[PDB]
Amino acid sequence: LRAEELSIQVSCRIMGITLVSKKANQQLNFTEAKEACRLLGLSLAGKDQVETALKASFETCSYGWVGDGFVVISRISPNPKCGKNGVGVLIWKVPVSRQFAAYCYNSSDTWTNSCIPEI
Numbered sequence: 681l682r683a684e685e686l687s688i689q690v691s692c693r694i695m696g697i698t699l700v701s702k703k704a705n706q707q708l709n710f711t712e713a714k715e716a717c718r719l720l721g722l723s724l725a726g727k728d729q730v731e732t733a734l735k736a737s738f739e740t741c742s743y744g745w746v747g748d749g750f751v752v753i754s755r756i757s758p759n760p761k762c763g764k765n766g767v768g769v770l771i772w773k774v775p776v777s778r779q780f781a782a783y784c785y786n787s788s789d790t791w792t793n794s795c796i797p798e799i
Protein backbone atom coordinates (compact mmCIF):
# COMPACT_ATOMS: atom_id res chain seq x y z
CA LEU A 681 0.00 0.00 0.00
CA ARG A 682 1.29 3.44 -1.01
CA ALA A 683 0.33 6.71 0.63
CA GLU A 684 -0.49 8.31 -2.72
CA GLU A 685 -3.33 5.84 -3.28
CA LEU A 686 -5.23 7.09 -0.21
CA SER A 687 -8.10 9.55 0.00
CA ILE A 688 -8.72 11.51 3.21
CA GLN A 689 -12.43 11.94 3.27
CA VAL A 690 -12.86 14.03 6.47
CA SER A 691 -10.74 17.18 6.61
CA CYS A 692 -12.23 18.60 9.83
CA ARG A 693 -11.53 15.82 12.31
CA ILE A 694 -14.14 15.27 15.02
CA MET A 695 -12.66 14.16 18.34
CA GLY A 696 -9.52 13.19 16.45
CA ILE A 697 -11.36 10.98 13.94
CA THR A 698 -11.08 10.95 10.16
CA LEU A 699 -12.28 8.52 7.50
CA VAL A 700 -9.68 7.27 5.00
CA SER A 701 -10.41 5.34 1.84
CA LYS A 702 -8.64 4.31 -1.26
CA LYS A 703 -8.74 6.19 -4.54
CA ALA A 704 -9.02 2.93 -6.51
CA ASN A 705 -11.91 0.53 -7.06
CA GLN A 706 -10.80 -1.73 -4.22
CA GLN A 707 -10.83 -0.55 -0.63
CA LEU A 708 -8.94 -1.65 2.46
CA ASN A 709 -8.87 -4.99 4.23
CA PHE A 710 -8.11 -4.93 7.97
CA THR A 711 -4.32 -5.08 7.54
CA GLU A 712 -4.43 -2.42 4.83
CA ALA A 713 -6.67 -0.18 6.95
CA LYS A 714 -4.11 -0.19 9.76
CA GLU A 715 -1.39 0.54 7.20
CA ALA A 716 -3.37 3.41 5.68
CA CYS A 717 -3.64 5.15 9.04
CA ARG A 718 0.01 4.40 9.86
CA LEU A 719 1.19 5.95 6.59
CA LEU A 720 -0.65 9.13 7.61
CA GLY A 721 0.86 9.15 11.10
CA LEU A 722 -2.40 8.03 12.70
CA SER A 723 -3.65 4.94 14.48
CA LEU A 724 -6.65 2.90 13.45
CA ALA A 725 -9.48 4.17 15.63
CA GLY A 726 -11.30 1.97 18.07
CA LYS A 727 -15.06 1.74 18.08
CA ASP A 728 -15.13 3.60 21.39
CA GLN A 729 -13.28 6.49 19.77
CA VAL A 730 -15.83 6.62 16.94
CA GLU A 731 -18.61 6.73 19.55
CA THR A 732 -16.88 9.69 21.16
CA ALA A 733 -16.78 11.38 17.75
CA LEU A 734 -20.45 10.55 17.13
CA LYS A 735 -21.28 12.32 20.41
CA ALA A 736 -19.81 15.41 18.70
CA SER A 737 -21.92 14.70 15.57
CA PHE A 738 -19.38 12.86 13.44
CA GLU A 739 -21.37 11.05 10.74
CA THR A 740 -20.48 8.92 7.72
CA CYS A 741 -22.20 6.75 5.17
CA SER A 742 -19.30 4.30 4.86
CA TYR A 743 -18.45 1.20 6.80
CA GLY A 744 -14.83 1.31 7.85
CA TRP A 745 -12.40 -0.77 9.86
CA VAL A 746 -11.72 -0.10 13.52
CA GLY A 747 -8.97 -1.64 15.62
CA ASP A 748 -11.47 -3.96 17.35
CA GLY A 749 -11.43 -6.11 14.20
CA PHE A 750 -14.82 -5.31 12.68
CA VAL A 751 -16.27 -2.45 10.60
CA VAL A 752 -18.51 0.37 11.85
CA ILE A 753 -20.60 3.23 10.51
CA SER A 754 -21.34 6.44 12.46
CA ARG A 755 -24.94 7.63 12.10
CA ILE A 756 -26.68 10.73 13.46
CA SER A 757 -29.87 10.54 11.41
CA PRO A 758 -31.55 7.49 9.85
CA ASN A 759 -30.97 6.72 6.18
CA PRO A 760 -31.94 3.32 4.72
CA LYS A 761 -28.69 3.14 2.69
CA CYS A 762 -26.41 3.89 5.67
CA GLY A 763 -26.37 1.30 8.44
CA LYS A 764 -29.84 0.04 7.56
CA ASN A 765 -31.55 3.22 8.79
CA GLY A 766 -30.04 3.07 12.28
CA VAL A 767 -28.42 5.73 14.41
CA GLY A 768 -25.38 5.12 16.57
CA VAL A 769 -22.03 3.54 15.83
CA LEU A 770 -23.21 0.33 14.21
CA ILE A 771 -21.12 -2.85 14.06
CA TRP A 772 -20.87 -5.25 11.13
CA LYS A 773 -18.75 -8.36 11.67
CA VAL A 774 -16.94 -9.17 8.43
CA PRO A 775 -13.94 -11.29 7.42
CA VAL A 776 -10.71 -9.40 7.89
CA SER A 777 -10.09 -9.96 4.17
CA ARG A 778 -13.15 -7.85 3.27
CA GLN A 779 -12.37 -4.35 1.95
CA PHE A 780 -13.85 -1.17 3.43
CA ALA A 781 -12.75 2.32 4.48
CA ALA A 782 -10.72 3.00 7.63
CA TYR A 783 -11.40 5.18 10.66
CA CYS A 784 -8.14 6.82 11.75
CA TYR A 785 -7.51 8.60 15.03
CA ASN A 786 -5.24 11.60 15.59
CA SER A 787 -4.26 11.81 19.26
CA SER A 788 -2.65 15.23 18.83
CA ASP A 789 -6.04 16.87 18.22
CA THR A 790 -7.14 18.83 21.28
CA TRP A 791 -10.28 20.48 19.84
CA THR A 792 -13.66 18.85 19.33
CA ASN A 793 -13.61 19.91 15.66
CA SER A 794 -10.09 20.44 14.33
CA CYS A 795 -11.45 23.29 12.16
CA ILE A 796 -12.92 25.14 15.19
CA PRO A 797 -10.62 26.64 17.87
CA GLU A 798 -11.82 25.98 21.41
CA ILE A 799 -10.81 26.84 24.97
Ligand SMILES: *[C@@H]1O[C@H](CO)[C@@H](O)[C@H](O)[C@H]1NC(C)=O
Pocket residue numbers: 692694736737738793794795796
Ligand atom coordinates in the same frame (compact mmCIF):
# COMPACT_ATOMS: atom_id res chain seq x y z
C1 LIG B 1 -16.45 21.04 11.77
O1 LIG B 1 -16.03 22.35 11.29
C2 LIG B 1 -16.29 22.58 9.90
C3 LIG B 1 -15.73 23.95 9.57
O2 LIG B 1 -16.64 24.99 9.93
C4 LIG B 1 -17.79 22.47 9.62
O3 LIG B 1 -18.03 22.67 8.23
C5 LIG B 1 -18.28 21.09 10.05
O4 LIG B 1 -19.68 20.99 9.84
C6 LIG B 1 -17.95 20.86 11.52
N1 LIG B 1 -18.40 19.54 11.94
C7 LIG B 1 -18.99 19.31 13.12
C8 LIG B 1 -19.40 17.89 13.39
O5 LIG B 1 -19.19 20.21 13.93
Ligand SMILES: *[C@@H]1O[C@H](CO)[C@@H](O)[C@H](O)[C@H]1NC(C)=O
Pocket residue numbers: 681709710711712776777
Ligand atom coordinates in the same frame (compact mmCIF):
# COMPACT_ATOMS: atom_id res chain seq x y z
C1 LIG C 1 -4.95 -7.71 2.85
O1 LIG C 1 -4.45 -7.21 1.61
C2 LIG C 1 -3.03 -7.40 1.42
C3 LIG C 1 -2.68 -6.77 0.09
O2 LIG C 1 -2.44 -5.38 0.22
C4 LIG C 1 -2.68 -8.88 1.50
O3 LIG C 1 -1.27 -9.02 1.43
C5 LIG C 1 -3.20 -9.50 2.79
O4 LIG C 1 -2.98 -10.91 2.77
C6 LIG C 1 -4.69 -9.22 2.94
N1 LIG C 1 -5.19 -9.77 4.19
C7 LIG C 1 -6.14 -10.72 4.23
C8 LIG C 1 -6.54 -11.20 5.59
O5 LIG C 1 -6.64 -11.17 3.21
Ligand SMILES: *[C@@H]1O[C@H](CO)[C@@H](O)[C@H](O)[C@H]1NC(C)=O
Pocket residue numbers: 720721722786787788789790794
Ligand atom coordinates in the same frame (compact mmCIF):
# COMPACT_ATOMS: atom_id res chain seq x y z
C1 LIG D 1 -3.21 15.83 14.07
O1 LIG D 1 -3.82 17.10 14.12
C2 LIG D 1 -2.88 18.16 14.32
C3 LIG D 1 -3.69 19.41 14.59
O2 LIG D 1 -4.42 19.28 15.80
C4 LIG D 1 -1.99 18.25 13.10
O3 LIG D 1 -1.04 19.30 13.30
C5 LIG D 1 -1.27 16.93 12.89
O4 LIG D 1 -0.54 16.97 11.67
C6 LIG D 1 -2.26 15.75 12.87
N1 LIG D 1 -1.54 14.48 12.87
C7 LIG D 1 -0.58 14.16 12.00
C8 LIG D 1 0.04 12.81 12.18
O5 LIG D 1 -0.22 14.93 11.12
